[PDB]
């Protein structure tokens, strides 16, 4: 069932991540998986070249399946058991890439850190679903991945309608 999905995913160079710099630049290949971030409703994103992934008859590819019925937590925790685990976590692996990303200094005591900001898959995927369900429209919509999102991430490849952003316009002195 799920195995052939993951099987075919590991076949291609498949990565599961919670954070990525792709969201800010389609050529960046930074992918990070924050293990503490994972919970019952944690939405995740994935990458294969050309966003492949076999399409189980139900019509769904692995990204769709993993994010439907909290299927990622279930599998990642163990109500699935060894087999449909550890090789799910075989792809939850990092990939450092700084190119095209910003570098900022952020004060820290006497001294500074330098931070390379990358974006969060859950806030994009789950965020957009949540503002959709609750009829919240004080937003901008942003389509990611360029024309050709299928080569950016799996969520970009399927959420072609775009991701919701908070409209942070302030009030004006009239």
């Amino acid at each position: 069932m799920i195995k052939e999905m993951i099987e075919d995913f590991i076949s291609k160079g498949g990565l599961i991540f919670t954070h990525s710099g792709r969201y800010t630049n389609t050529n960046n290949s930074c992918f990070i998986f924050n293990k503490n971030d994972i919970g019952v409703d944690t939405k995740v994103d994935m990458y294969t070249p050309k966003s492949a992934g076999i399409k189980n008859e139900e019509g769904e590819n692995l990204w769709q399946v993993l994010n439907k019925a909290n299927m990622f937590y279930r599998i990642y925790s163990g109500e699935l058991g060894e087999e449909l685990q550890y090789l799910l976590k075989s792809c939850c692996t990092a990939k450092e890439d700084v190119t095209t990303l910003p570098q900022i200094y952020f004060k820290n005591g006497e001294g500074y850190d330098i931070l390379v900001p990358i974006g969060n898959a859950h806030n994009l995927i789950s965020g957009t679903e949540y503002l959709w369900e609750h009829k919240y429209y004080n937003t901008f919509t942003q389509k990611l991945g360029g024309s050709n999102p299928q080569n950016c991430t799996h969520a970009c490849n399927k959420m072609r309608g775009g991701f919701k952003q908070f409209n942070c316009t302030p009030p004006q002195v009239e």
Binding site: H19, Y23, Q103, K107, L115, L124, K164, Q165, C168, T169
Partner: protein, 224 residues
């Protein structure tokens, strides 16, 4: 809480309105904290905190049909430590603003900087009102999360810092190979806007860096 320099009507063109993947509009308090911190570095002046307010602001294309760029006008107020003079401060600040940037956009003009002083809480309200008119940013905290809070409290999310995710291993492309570098992702708080004069305690509008890679106000979460 003694000395403050105020710069009214800083007009800024071509602001990069995108402060995170999910926030487009007003530049977050990190940005203005970074402005003051940058001023401190270049001018040698000690900057304690910064209050900033909105006067005008518009994301391009959001009022009329014509990466997300904006333009607006802000009023700034820096809490400062300085006793060498009064206009030698005003000149060092003028000199820095003329070429500073705010979220990537260029300053086009500003009123002349001026200095205000507070000896107690009551004079502090005079510093506050000298910013009028503008809508300053105050910290309302997160109750549940920014999504639920945005729907239910009808408040506005704002980048307030970063969570370090991993240390960067090979500094090949890093600008600076000595400062500790981290892959990081923004953290948020919820903010509200107040016509400055309506702010009870000015400490609650004065933003500065804090522990664990966040900014916050001197006086904490805003309360009426």
């Amino acid at each position: 809480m003694r000395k403050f320099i105020i710069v009214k009507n800083v007009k800024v063109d071509g602001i990069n309105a995108k402060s995170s993947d999910i926030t487009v509009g007003m530049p977050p308090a990190t940005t203005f904290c970074g402005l003051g911190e940058t001023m401190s570095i270049k001018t040698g002046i000690v900057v304690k905190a910064v209050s900033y307010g909105s006067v005008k602001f518009e994301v391009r294309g959001s009022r009329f049909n014509t990466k997300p760029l904006a333009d607006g006008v802000f009023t700034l107020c820096f809490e400062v430590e300085w006793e060498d003079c009064a206009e030698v401060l005003v000149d060092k600040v003028t000199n820095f603003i003329n070429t500073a940037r705010i979220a990537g956009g260029t300053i086009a003009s500003f009123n002349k900087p001026f200095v205000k002083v507070a000896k107690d809480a009551e004079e502090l309200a005079s510093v506050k009102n000298a910013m009028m008119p503008c809508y300053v940013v105050v910290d309302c905290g997160v109750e549940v999360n920014i999504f639920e809070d945005a729907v239910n409290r009808k408040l506005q999310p704002m980048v307030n810092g970063y969570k370090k995710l991993e240390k960067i291993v090979d500094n090949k492309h890093m600008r600076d190979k000595f400062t500790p570098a981290y892959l990081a992702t923004p953290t948020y708080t919820m903010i509200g806007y107040k016509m400055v004069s309506n702010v009870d305690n000015f400490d609650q509008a004065l933003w500065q860096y804090g522990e664990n890679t966040k900014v916050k106000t001197i006086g904490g979460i805003y309360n009426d």
